[PDB]
Enzyme design. Structure first.
Site, PDB file in Angstrom:
ATOM      1  N   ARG A   1      14.713  23.615  23.784  1.00  0.00           N
ATOM      2  CA  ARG A   1      13.514  22.809  23.990  1.00  0.00           C
ATOM      3  C   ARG A   1      13.140  22.006  22.750  1.00  0.00           C
ATOM      4  NH1 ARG A   1      13.598  26.506  27.630  1.00  0.00           N
ATOM      5  NH2 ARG A   1      12.647  26.097  29.672  1.00  0.00           N
TER       6      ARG A   1
ATOM      7  N   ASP B   1       7.167  -7.825  -5.833  1.00  0.00           N
ATOM      8  CA  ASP B   1       6.441  -6.578  -5.612  1.00  0.00           C
ATOM      9  C   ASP B   1       5.583  -6.215  -6.818  1.00  0.00           C
ATOM     10  OD1 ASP B   1       7.456  -3.400  -4.084  1.00  0.00           O
ATOM     11  OD2 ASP B   1       5.908  -4.862  -3.550  1.00  0.00           O
TER      12      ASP B   1
ATOM     13  N   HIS C   1       0.583  -5.824   3.726  1.00  0.00           N
ATOM     14  CA  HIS C   1       0.992  -5.876   2.327  1.00  0.00           C
ATOM     15  C   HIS C   1       2.326  -6.594   2.164  1.00  0.00           C
ATOM     16  CE1 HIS C   1       2.144  -4.498  -1.715  1.00  0.00           C
ATOM     17  NE2 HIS C   1       3.284  -4.129  -1.159  1.00  0.00           N
TER      18      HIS C   1
ATOM     19  N   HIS D   1      11.069  -4.379   2.723  1.00  0.00           N
ATOM     20  CA  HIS D   1      11.214  -3.638   1.479  1.00  0.00           C
ATOM     21  C   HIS D   1      10.540  -2.273   1.523  1.00  0.00           C
ATOM     22  CE1 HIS D   1       7.039  -4.285   0.403  1.00  0.00           C
ATOM     23  NE2 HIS D   1       7.232  -3.700  -0.764  1.00  0.00           N
ATOM     24  N   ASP D   2       9.910  -1.917   2.648  1.00  0.00           N
ATOM     25  CA  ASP D   2       9.258  -0.619   2.780  1.00  0.00           C
ATOM     26  C   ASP D   2       9.486   0.004   4.155  1.00  0.00           C
ATOM     27  OD1 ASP D   2       8.247   0.112   0.347  1.00  0.00           O
ATOM     28  OD2 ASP D   2       6.135   0.023   0.943  1.00  0.00           O
TER      29      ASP D   2
HETATM   30  N1  LIG Z   1      -2.555   6.706  -3.769  1.00  0.00           N
HETATM   31  C1  LIG Z   1      -1.882   6.000  -4.686  1.00  0.00           C
HETATM   32  N2  LIG Z   1      -1.278   4.874  -4.336  1.00  0.00           N
HETATM   33  C2  LIG Z   1      -0.645   4.271  -5.361  1.00  0.00           C
HETATM   34  C3  LIG Z   1      -0.572   4.705  -6.661  1.00  0.00           C
HETATM   35  N3  LIG Z   1       0.170   3.820  -7.424  1.00  0.00           N
HETATM   36  C4  LIG Z   1       0.524   2.888  -6.589  1.00  0.00           C
HETATM   37  N4  LIG Z   1       0.062   3.098  -5.320  1.00  0.00           N
HETATM   38  C5  LIG Z   1       0.281   2.248  -4.131  1.00  0.00           C
HETATM   39  O1  LIG Z   1       1.672   2.196  -3.854  1.00  0.00           O
HETATM   40  C6  LIG Z   1       2.188   0.870  -4.107  1.00  0.00           C
HETATM   41  C7  LIG Z   1       3.486   0.942  -4.876  1.00  0.00           C
HETATM   42  O2  LIG Z   1       4.161   2.204  -4.698  1.00  0.00           O
HETATM   43  P1  LIG Z   1       4.673   3.036  -5.936  1.00  0.00           P
HETATM   44  O3  LIG Z   1       4.768   4.492  -5.514  1.00  0.00           O
HETATM   45  O4  LIG Z   1       3.840   2.798  -7.130  1.00  0.00           O
HETATM   46  O5  LIG Z   1       6.163   2.527  -6.144  1.00  0.00           O
HETATM   47  P2  LIG Z   1       7.181   1.573  -5.375  1.00  0.00           P
HETATM   48  O6  LIG Z   1       6.907   0.157  -5.631  1.00  0.00           O
HETATM   49  O7  LIG Z   1       7.175   1.992  -3.909  1.00  0.00           O
HETATM   50  O8  LIG Z   1       8.567   1.990  -5.960  1.00  0.00           O
HETATM   51  P3  LIG Z   1      10.068   1.486  -5.981  1.00  0.00           P
HETATM   52  O9  LIG Z   1      10.632   1.481  -4.611  1.00  0.00           O
HETATM   53  O10 LIG Z   1      10.772   2.423  -6.941  1.00  0.00           O
HETATM   54  O11 LIG Z   1       9.998   0.123  -6.613  1.00  0.00           O
HETATM   55  C8  LIG Z   1       1.077   0.122  -4.835  1.00  0.00           C
HETATM   56  O12 LIG Z   1       1.093  -1.251  -4.451  1.00  0.00           O
HETATM   57  C9  LIG Z   1      -0.179   0.813  -4.325  1.00  0.00           C
HETATM   58  O13 LIG Z   1      -0.584   0.257  -3.075  1.00  0.00           O
HETATM   59  C10 LIG Z   1      -1.225   5.919  -7.023  1.00  0.00           C
HETATM   60  O14 LIG Z   1      -1.276   6.469  -8.122  1.00  0.00           O
HETATM   61  N5  LIG Z   1      -1.872   6.519  -5.953  1.00  0.00           N
HETATM   62 MG   LIG Z   2       5.776  -3.108  -2.248  1.00  0.00          MG
END
Ligand SMILES: Nc1nc2c(ncn2[C@@H]2O[C@H](COP(=O)(O)OP(=O)(O)OP(=O)(O)O)[C@@H](O)[C@H]2O)c(=O)[nH]1
Ligand SMILES: [Mg+2]
Ligand SMILES: Nc1nc2c(ncn2[C@@H]2O[C@H](COP(=O)(O)OP(=O)(O)OP(=O)(O)O)[C@@H](O)[C@H]2O)c(=O)[nH]1
Ligand SMILES: [Mg+2]
Lengths: 476, 84, 234, 84
Positions: free
Chosen positions: A414, A257, A62, A110-111
């Protein structure tokens, strides 16, 4: 006066390159950073973390698509400025190289700070601490449900630190963990300009109250922790950023993003036989109310030929709009006080089309929903297993970290050896600096111990955490 | 994109803080016609059912909208504990 | 009172000789390290020539320990025999407050002692099993806790009737105990004076002993399986 | 060879029993140079940091050493509750 030479900083924190450099050796500095980031253990671990479905895309695949979209927005911005003969006036005459590289590396990492299981893994860490620290009881004068004697309000100069520590520990965010991972744990020693590209938000984690209306969007989420307060001030001094301000290049990474948010999940749904290509096309037609973007791709194919043109069609319509929005509001972005995002027109309404279809037909699947509940249970159980480590005293924990062979704490010792060596080294370095003969040592020691516990949990893959949880409960 | 956990926790904390004064909060949420932004309406009333005041907030971002709701609830609590 | 049997001293010295030497050999068979690495570690920890060096040059895995054991036995056994013979009246009386094994002989055992605790007992795989075993025994005692919460009359009815319509859960747990432990409990409680103010205390003590006998008489593998099955996991 | 669980439990019980009189115990342990026996040093002091007394015990067996430490702690508690 806009001058990008005062923003693109090629200096480092340790063994910084001094002296005047030419245009060629400046570019060589930004390539070693690329080599460091691409060949880092933090990036390799991204292929064992799930996006939605456990040929499906992972976080590594991604982030590779987000990197391509970022390149393309930067190239459009650079080419449009040359038509107006503003490249030399803005200081970008000899900086077109690093300009795209910084965006490309910010999009890549970014993740890297997300915990296992993602969002529901983030909530589980927050609730478990919220029950032990009760931050809402330290907002005002002493009342106290806190389970720690040292952090209970009782001493005006010491209560502010107590409430700051109690509030910060209940606010875990992945973006705030990214800065800590890149600087303190991994010790990559990146340039100042590269670190500023991953500072998405500016709100401190210990902030309690109402944010100023001038920065209500840039401070919607926590940006950094209290243990990095000294590091963020140096970064602001190096990049000439005011308080609660943003780096100019962060806006391009944010727009990339937003474009790649749901389109990949829709394609991944078809590969899992949730529906067919024709069914997805019918659903999109019903939800839309398209001809230039979706219809062109539909008639040009059938599964690996429908999305391949839809992506191109939406990029060719979204990228120029983002470039124009970046160029128009240039002084505010350069100052760092732009309180809006690049992406209320036909362009922003199109993304909601993909947004609404994904939440109704993909995110609501029973198999996706089950994994979210199982992940919440796994993280909560792991924190309970290591709870005895947080119940020890300062002397006992000091003896544990110093002797490593304790005859009085067989169970606690431990559990201590299971923590990674890098986290233990970071803890030792952090506590090896505070004044020992101060009335603030126990509070800082407890804060650093909690941070050490939080680093170990968030640095796991989903698959490793499940296995460790099952093994530590005598199930497997 | 999704609402952050801390904002929801703060909203719930404010709701409970105002509930400690034998009060209640009703919550309504919807999407507007053409403004292209979500709307949330809050009403504050006591246990007997006598409505005190209401407010409506509109925004296209969840985080900002929830923060505005939380700070309005905190201001209501502050004003209602200034007297009575 | 508080005296020892004379022959117990010989058994104590035998266990002290065979304390860590076998674990070091078992570590090599699990590829923790190699024979050369173990020899280097022993040379570094020692500071040997008559015992370890003789075996090293006489081999390579099943030929290094086979002579090390002989070399250490030929130096340790006569010392133990002489120590037993010298302090004979005290050992015979049973008041000898020391062990057979502060010389070059006792210092040699610490060599094997220190290497084993640092390179074998600290392995992650050994440490994990110690934590899992502690959790298994604690869980088994909680499952049988309802047996300890019953009254004297209820437990007497359970042990006498064996078909109780008032305690369905408690009766089924009772049939899982081994028959020998139940027979021992019956024989033990079948002797105390019934019309005494000490019957409940002795009955509770014997019930706790019966519970402790069942847990301690299991193999590691059986206890894990029973714990997993009783928790509806397997 | 290893320390028995009951001895450690008794040592902890004595430590808590003396801690019930708003006191504290510091623990140090090491190995001596040539005596070939482990050494454990205990110091008893109140919360303000005023040292009361210290003791050091040497032995090559863990069980005996811990029993000596426990009985010395019990004697300290007894003497400190005879008066004050
Ligand atoms: N299971 C699930 N995945 C989601 C959902 N919405 C988005 N996603 C996934 O998560 C990605 C984005 O994550 P988000 O939690 O929406 O937010 P973010 O972009 O990480 O957030 P910021 O760091 O605040 O920008 C999307 O590209 C999807 O792949 C949802 O409701 N459920
Ligand atoms: Mg992203
Ligand atoms: N896992 C582990 N095993 C050990 C350790 N020390 C000794 N052992 C093993 O256990 C054996 C001896 O058991 P110990 O617990 O040391 O004591 P013991 O001989 O049973 O004790 P007594 O009945 O009091 O004489 C050794 O031969 C080793 O096989 C240790 O630290 N860890
Ligand atoms: Mg033995």
């Amino acid at each position: 006066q806009i001058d990008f030479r005062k923003k693109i900083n090629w200096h480092r924190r340790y063994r910084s390159p001094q002296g005047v450099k030419t245009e060629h050796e400046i570019l060589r500095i930004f390539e070693s950073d690329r080599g460091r980031i691409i060949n880092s253990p933090a990036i390799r671990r991204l292929q064992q973390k799930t996006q939605v479905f456990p040929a499906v895309r992972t976080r590594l695949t991604h982030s590779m698509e987000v990197q391509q979209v970022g390149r393309y927005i930067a190239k459009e911005i650079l080419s449009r400025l040359k038509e107006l003969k503003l490249l030399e006036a803005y200081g970008l005459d000899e900086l077109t190289g690093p300009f795209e590289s910084i965006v490309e590396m910010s999009c890549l990492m970014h993740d890297i700070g997300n915990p296992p299981f993602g969002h529901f893994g983030e909530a589980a860490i927050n609730d478990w601490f919220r029950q032990r620290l009760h931050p809402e009881d330290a907002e005002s004068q002493p009342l106290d449900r806190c389970s720690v004697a040292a952090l209970r309000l009782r001493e005006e100069p010491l209560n502010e630190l107590r409430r700051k520590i109690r509030q910060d520990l209940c606010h875990f965010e992945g973006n705030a963990q990214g800065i800590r991972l890149v600087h303190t744990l991994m010790r990559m020693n990146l340039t100042w300009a590269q670190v500023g590209g991953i500072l998405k938000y500016t709100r401190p984690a210990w902030w309690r109250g109402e944010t100023p209306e001038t920065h209500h969007y840039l401070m919607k989420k926590p940006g950094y922790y209290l243990s990095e307060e000294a590091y963020i001030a140096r970064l602001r001094k190096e990049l000439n950023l005011a308080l609660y301000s943003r780096f100019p290049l962060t806006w391009i990474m944010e727009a990339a993003d937003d474009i790649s948010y749901c389109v990949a999940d829709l394609e991944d749904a078809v590969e899992k036989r949730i529906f067919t290509v024709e069914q997805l096309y019918h659903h999109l037609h019903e939800a839309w109310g398209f001809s230039l973007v979706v219809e062109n791709a539909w008639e040009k194919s059938t599964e690996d030929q429908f999305f391949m043109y839809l992506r191109v069609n939406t990029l060719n319509k979204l990228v120029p709009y983002a470039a124009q929005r970046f160029i128009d509001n240039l002084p505010a972005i350069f100052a760092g006080t732009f309180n809006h995002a690049l992406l209320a027109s036909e362009c922003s309404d199109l993304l909601k089309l993909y947004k609404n279809v994904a939440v109704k037909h993909v995110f609501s699947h029973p198999d996706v929903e089950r994994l979210e509940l199982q992940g919440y249970r796994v993280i909560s159980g792991l924190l309970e297993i290591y709870r005895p480590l947080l119940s020890l005293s300062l002397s006992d924990f000091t003896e544990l970290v110093e002797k490593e062979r304790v005859k009085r704490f067989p169970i606690e010792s431990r559990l201590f050896h299971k923590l990674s060596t890098r986290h233990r080294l970071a803890y030792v370095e952090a506590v090896s600096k505070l004044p020992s003969d101060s009335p603030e040592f126990p509070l800082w020691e407890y804060y650093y111990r909690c941070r050490l516990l939080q680093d170990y949990i968030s640095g796991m893959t989903d698959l490793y955490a499940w296995d460790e949880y099952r093994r530590l409960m005598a199930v497997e | 994109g999704r609402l952050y956990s801390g904002n929801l926790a703060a909203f719930k904390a404010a709701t409970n803080k105002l509930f400690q004064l034998d009060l209640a909060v009703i919550y309504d949420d919807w999407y507007d016609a053409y403004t292209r932004k979500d709307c949330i309406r809050l009403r504050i009333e006591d246990r007997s059912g006598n409505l005190i005041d209401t407010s409506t907030f509109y925004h296209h971002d969840e985080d900002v909208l929830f923060n505005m709701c939380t700070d309005w609830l905190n201001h209501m609590y502050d004003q209602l504990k200034d007297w009575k």
